[PDB]
Amino acid sequence: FACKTANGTAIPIGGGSANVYVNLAPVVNVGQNLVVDLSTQIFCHNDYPETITDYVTLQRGSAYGGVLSNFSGTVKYSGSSYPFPTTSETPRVVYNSRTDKPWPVALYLTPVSSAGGVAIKAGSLIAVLILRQTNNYNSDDFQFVWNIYANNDVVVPT
Numbered sequence: 082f083a084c085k086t087a088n089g090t091a092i093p094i095g096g097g098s099a100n101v102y103v104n105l106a107p108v109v110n111v112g113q114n115l116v117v118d119l120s121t122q123i124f125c126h127n128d129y130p131e132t133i134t135d136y137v138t139l140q141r142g143s144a145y146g147g148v149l150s151n152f153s154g155t156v157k158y159s160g161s162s163y164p165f166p167t168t169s170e171t172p173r174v175v176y177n178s179r180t181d182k183p184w185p186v187a188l189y190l191t192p193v194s195s196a197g198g199v200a201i202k203a204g205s206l207i208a209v210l211i212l213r214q215t216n217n218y219n220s221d222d223f224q225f226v227w228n229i230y231a232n233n234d235v236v237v238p239t
């Protein structure tokens with residue numbers, strides 16, 4: 082089991098970490114969601130689906146910088162909504178194919194009422210997402226750590 086970003090940056094068998102740079106809606110009104118769809122940015126696959134079934138969760142999701150101070154967050158993992166920053170490990174998604182399959186995570190970030198002005202700075206770390214991979218075959222328990230960075234400023238109008 083291993084993962085890659087949309088630009089080919091890989092985290093190999095055994096886990097590790099990678100940077101993910103995301104374009105963000107430059108203007109987000111109070112009452113609207115800023116959507117960070119990681120399903121188009123992170124892809125994983127099973128290296129031995131002939132024998133092994135891989136299990137994949139979002140173990141933890143943390144917010145940083147302007148996302149932590151200016152937004153109220155929800156994470157969707159495989160269609161189910163949870164608080165972000167996260168309070169528990171998600172249920173497992175099965176990876177049973179060698180074909181790249183999106184990691185089904187998306188952040189929905191709505192501005193808090195105190196938000197206004199440049200709410201997310203360009204180049205800043207906005208989130209760290211820990212993917213945890215196990216299987217039905219051995220004791221492998223690996224972390225794939227995704228550091229999410231904003232490619233641009235995001236303003237909440239005042």
Ligand SMILES: CC(=O)c1cnc(N[C@H]2O[C@H](CO)[C@@H](O)[C@H](O)[C@@H]2O)s1
Binds near residue numbers: 082127129135
């Ligand atoms: C041939 C053989 O024994 C193995 C091949 N790959 C192995 N193991 C690798 O691939 C598995 C399936 O994605 C993962 O469950 C493991 O965690 C590891 O990434 S063992």
